[PDB]
Enzyme design. Sequence first.
Site, mmCIF file in Angstrom:
data_model
loop_
_atom_site.group_PDB
_atom_site.id
_atom_site.type_symbol
_atom_site.label_atom_id
_atom_site.label_comp_id
_atom_site.label_asym_id
_atom_site.label_seq_id
_atom_site.Cartn_x
_atom_site.Cartn_y
_atom_site.Cartn_z
ATOM 1 N N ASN A 79 0.098 -3.875 0.598
ATOM 2 C CA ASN A 79 0.772 -4.295 -0.621
ATOM 3 C C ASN A 79 0.461 -3.118 -1.552
ATOM 4 O O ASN A 79 -0.197 -2.168 -1.144
ATOM 5 C CB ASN A 79 0.141 -5.581 -1.160
ATOM 6 C CG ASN A 79 1.092 -6.377 -2.047
ATOM 7 O OD1 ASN A 79 1.698 -5.841 -2.975
ATOM 8 N ND2 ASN A 79 1.214 -7.671 -1.765
ATOM 9 N N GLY A 101 9.654 -0.112 -0.036
ATOM 10 C CA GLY A 101 9.681 -0.744 -1.338
ATOM 11 C C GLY A 101 10.241 0.176 -2.403
ATOM 12 O O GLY A 101 11.452 0.208 -2.633
ATOM 13 N N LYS A 114 12.025 -12.384 -1.080
ATOM 14 C CA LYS A 114 11.040 -12.201 -2.145
ATOM 15 C C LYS A 114 9.964 -13.271 -1.953
ATOM 16 O O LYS A 114 10.282 -14.395 -1.583
ATOM 17 C CB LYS A 114 11.718 -12.384 -3.511
ATOM 18 C CG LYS A 114 10.763 -12.578 -4.693
ATOM 19 C CD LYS A 114 9.913 -11.339 -4.952
ATOM 20 C CE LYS A 114 8.967 -11.538 -6.125
ATOM 21 N NZ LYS A 114 8.152 -10.311 -6.393
ATOM 22 N N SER A 131 4.326 -5.080 -12.496
ATOM 23 C CA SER A 131 3.582 -6.305 -12.735
ATOM 24 C C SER A 131 4.696 -7.325 -12.941
ATOM 25 O O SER A 131 4.869 -7.876 -14.035
ATOM 26 C CB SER A 131 2.720 -6.197 -13.987
ATOM 27 O OG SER A 131 1.925 -7.364 -14.125
ATOM 28 N N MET A 132 5.458 -7.553 -11.874
ATOM 29 C CA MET A 132 6.591 -8.466 -11.923
ATOM 30 C C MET A 132 6.198 -9.895 -12.282
ATOM 31 O O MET A 132 6.921 -10.576 -13.015
ATOM 32 C CB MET A 132 7.348 -8.447 -10.589
ATOM 33 C CG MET A 132 7.768 -7.061 -10.112
ATOM 34 S SD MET A 132 8.764 -6.100 -11.294
ATOM 35 C CE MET A 132 10.356 -6.989 -11.212
ATOM 36 N N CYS A 157 -1.699 -13.223 -3.205
ATOM 37 C CA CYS A 157 -1.336 -14.327 -4.084
ATOM 38 C C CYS A 157 -2.547 -14.720 -4.935
ATOM 39 O O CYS A 157 -3.689 -14.408 -4.586
ATOM 40 C CB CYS A 157 -0.867 -15.529 -3.252
ATOM 41 S SG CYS A 157 -2.083 -16.167 -2.046
ATOM 42 N N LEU A 169 5.555 -12.276 -9.922
ATOM 43 C CA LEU A 169 6.181 -13.111 -8.904
ATOM 44 C C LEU A 169 7.436 -13.850 -9.344
ATOM 45 O O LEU A 169 7.539 -15.065 -9.183
ATOM 46 C CB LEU A 169 5.180 -14.118 -8.328
ATOM 47 C CG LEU A 169 4.157 -13.557 -7.335
ATOM 48 C CD1 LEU A 169 3.231 -14.683 -6.882
ATOM 49 C CD2 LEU A 169 4.875 -12.933 -6.138
HETATM 50 C C1 FMN Z 1 9.000 -4.383 -8.057
HETATM 51 C C2 FMN Z 1 8.078 -4.777 -6.829
HETATM 52 C C3 FMN Z 1 7.977 -6.127 -6.416
HETATM 53 C C4 FMN Z 1 7.173 -6.413 -5.329
HETATM 54 N N1 FMN Z 1 7.094 -7.741 -4.911
HETATM 55 C C5 FMN Z 1 6.323 -8.083 -3.802
HETATM 56 C C6 FMN Z 1 6.333 -9.501 -3.433
HETATM 57 O O1 FMN Z 1 6.920 -10.463 -3.963
HETATM 58 N N2 FMN Z 1 5.551 -9.764 -2.292
HETATM 59 C C7 FMN Z 1 4.811 -8.835 -1.533
HETATM 60 O O2 FMN Z 1 4.174 -9.165 -0.553
HETATM 61 N N3 FMN Z 1 4.878 -7.542 -1.989
HETATM 62 C C8 FMN Z 1 5.580 -7.077 -3.073
HETATM 63 N N4 FMN Z 1 5.626 -5.752 -3.475
HETATM 64 C C9 FMN Z 1 4.891 -4.841 -2.750
HETATM 65 C C10 FMN Z 1 5.713 -4.225 -1.588
HETATM 66 O O3 FMN Z 1 6.102 -5.152 -0.597
HETATM 67 C C11 FMN Z 1 5.063 -2.971 -1.030
HETATM 68 O O4 FMN Z 1 3.966 -3.542 -0.281
HETATM 69 C C12 FMN Z 1 4.680 -1.879 -2.134
HETATM 70 O O5 FMN Z 1 5.693 -1.585 -3.076
HETATM 71 C C13 FMN Z 1 4.099 -0.684 -1.383
HETATM 72 O O6 FMN Z 1 5.270 -0.027 -0.761
HETATM 73 P P1 FMN Z 1 6.114 1.226 -1.338
HETATM 74 O O7 FMN Z 1 5.157 2.359 -1.376
HETATM 75 O O8 FMN Z 1 7.218 1.554 -0.399
HETATM 76 O O9 FMN Z 1 6.611 0.791 -2.681
HETATM 77 C C14 FMN Z 1 6.438 -5.373 -4.619
HETATM 78 C C15 FMN Z 1 6.544 -4.046 -5.048
HETATM 79 C C16 FMN Z 1 7.347 -3.741 -6.125
HETATM 80 C C17 FMN Z 1 7.451 -2.264 -6.560
HETATM 81 O O1 ORO Z 2 5.807 -10.140 -7.960
HETATM 82 C C1 ORO Z 2 4.912 -9.303 -8.239
HETATM 83 O O2 ORO Z 2 4.543 -8.935 -9.371
HETATM 84 C C2 ORO Z 2 4.176 -8.636 -7.077
HETATM 85 C C3 ORO Z 2 3.675 -9.348 -6.015
HETATM 86 C C4 ORO Z 2 2.979 -8.649 -4.930
HETATM 87 O O3 ORO Z 2 2.508 -9.214 -3.946
HETATM 88 N N1 ORO Z 2 2.887 -7.245 -5.091
HETATM 89 C C5 ORO Z 2 3.386 -6.484 -6.165
HETATM 90 O O4 ORO Z 2 3.262 -5.249 -6.231
HETATM 91 N N2 ORO Z 2 4.042 -7.240 -7.162
#
Ligand code: FMN
Ligand code: ORO
Lengths: 311, 311
Positions: free
Chosen positions: A193, A271, A43, A68-69, A130, A71
Amino acid sequence: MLNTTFANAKFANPFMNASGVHCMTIEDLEELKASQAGAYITKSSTLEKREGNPLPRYVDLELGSINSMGLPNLGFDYYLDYVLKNQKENAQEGPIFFSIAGMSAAENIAMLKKIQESDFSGITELNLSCPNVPGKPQLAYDFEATEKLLKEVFTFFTKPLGVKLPPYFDLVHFDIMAEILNQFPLTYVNSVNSIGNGLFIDPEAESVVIKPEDGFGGIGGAYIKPTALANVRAFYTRLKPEIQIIGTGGIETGQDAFEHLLCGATMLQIGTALHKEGPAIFDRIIKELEEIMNQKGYQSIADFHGKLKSL
Amino acid sequence: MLNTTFANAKFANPFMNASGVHCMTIEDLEELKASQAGAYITKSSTLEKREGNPLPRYVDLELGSINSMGLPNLGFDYYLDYVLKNQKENAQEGPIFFSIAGMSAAENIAMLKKIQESDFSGITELNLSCPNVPGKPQLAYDFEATEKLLKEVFTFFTKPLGVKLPPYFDLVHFDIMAEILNQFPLTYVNSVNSIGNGLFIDPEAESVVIKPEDGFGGIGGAYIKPTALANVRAFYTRLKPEIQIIGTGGIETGQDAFEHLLCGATMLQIGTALHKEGPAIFDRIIKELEEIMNQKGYQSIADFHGKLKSL
Ligand SMILES: Cc1cc2nc3c(=O)[nH]c(=O)nc-3n(C[C@H](O)[C@H](O)[C@H](O)COP(=O)(O)O)c2cc1C
Ligand SMILES: O=C(O)c1cc(=O)[nH]c(=O)[nH]1
Ligand SMILES: Cc1cc2nc3c(=O)[nH]c(=O)nc-3n(C[C@H](O)[C@H](O)[C@H](O)COP(=O)(O)O)c2cc1C
Ligand SMILES: O=C(O)c1cc(=O)[nH]c(=O)[nH]1
Ligand SMILES: [Mg+2]
Ligand SMILES: [Mg+2]
């Protein structure tokens, strides 16, 4: 059939979890290690432990997801200590990926310095989505800020480094970014992302579905595959061969994986689909891709990698 | 139930075609006039007649559409002549909308000057997704260029004017754009144009589906509703009340329309769904929206307009 070479390392297959999904704790990570995933990433961490945003902050949607976690993570030291200990066991083919997303430029530099100084022999991923200066767009949408940061980083960071980028929607933007990135000895670019600040509404309740940011959140899943594929392809034809690509966005079936690989991606991250299905998805999608390859008579990803045909 | 007041004019309902769909010829326009659409807009025109890009340039997708039409149109004079003649017949409640997308800033200023000088009493829509300097992003993604253009425009254009904008994905961008737009006596903002440069692939053929731009094209349909709704809402809470909003993006059912209106949109435009269904869609969606309103006990759009609830 899926054997892959990336960042000068060998992987059983190109599949990985996308940062943020199923990689929060050591337990999450161990489950990823135990699955069929060719590799996994932690993460995105910050210097300090983060609780993240108020719930609900993640919602499954028919065509994907919104989040909208904020981070949430257990802190840099927690992840660094974990990867350092696993590195020693040599019970895993292919390095672990370490994601960082500093709340500030100073925080990113500080974490990169600690990784550099440590014995970490794995791969690092700098999340350029970020936070950034108050009245400034996310780092990756601020070309000037992005270039400035990377130049400082490369004055000292010698270990494998990749950047996680947000999606771009203008060809000139791809040109500008490619030009900026090509001047550095980057290991890879990871597109993309989530699609930023989308909105989902429950029509009956007449309200948003996540609590933070008035319901605005990153969009993932089927909604974004067209955008994700475009970014992977656009960078594949602009980046110097030294910089490989990790394809992320809307990957759920072997066909989706096939499309990203056809565009030029070498590694693939899941993801949303992983969040819904769990680690078992890797075994399923791997078999799906192999079946597609078998029907076409392909024995290695090299038979079609980057061979997307234009009309 | 759907009676709407927009730009100080009255419309039977908020529904309209989205520029580019079913509005190329006088015949297309007459069919729109004959349909149940509350209002209609012409295809974005340029000074000269344009053939557009090579085919195939538009493809229906399960979750929407992808296109790279290349602004095919019959020329400014053709559209201006048409609206001027219909204006005289007074056989239509509510003004016609006139879209322009100059190949250059000089071309937009030239067309706006001709509209100003003409007797046109309708509404004009400036497509800020129009071409721009070679090494520059589409006009609306170049904040500096956008502000410069609008300032010149308002030194002489006194007739109703709205701007068609591409989607934004960063909150700071919404702030910057809102600040730029709020300084002008704009009639409205129309969000959003298609999600730019997406890519769709036929996995069997291992190739793209449209001929121009190596298969890259604007994405419309279900893929983009989350983004479209976000843009409508983000501007609704940032724009001065003088500037109303037209919601465009992923509208196919009464529920989709309900969501845009809930966000703050006053007029609604249908692109992809109209392209697939034809003018008959207006009668269907109108009834769908009215049924939704009836179930909730609403007799006017004012009962829920802009009332999207946050958690
Ligand atoms: C719940 C959640 C948390 C995520 N956290 C991160 C994160 O900490 N860092 C990051 O680079 N991307 C994060 N992403 C983005 C994913 O790495 C990915 O780029 C995004 O979900 C697009 O892929 P998908 O279509 O397979 O979901 C997050 C996505 C979701 C849904
Ligand atoms: O931790 C998150 O909210 C987060 C970070 C990120 O880079 N991308 C995302 O979709 N969520
Ligand atoms: C074939 C096609 C042509 C289009 N032409 C224009 C155009 O000339 N001007 C403009 O402002 N938008 C144009 N658009 C964008 C639409 O007006 C609309 O913003 C987009 O399709 C998003 O809406 P939708 O989800 O309902 O399709 C076009 C879209 C399509 C699919
Ligand atoms: O004519 C086109 O290609 C076109 C113009 C525009 O503004 N938007 C779009 O999706 N297509
Ligand atoms: Mg394993
Ligand atoms: Mg009519």
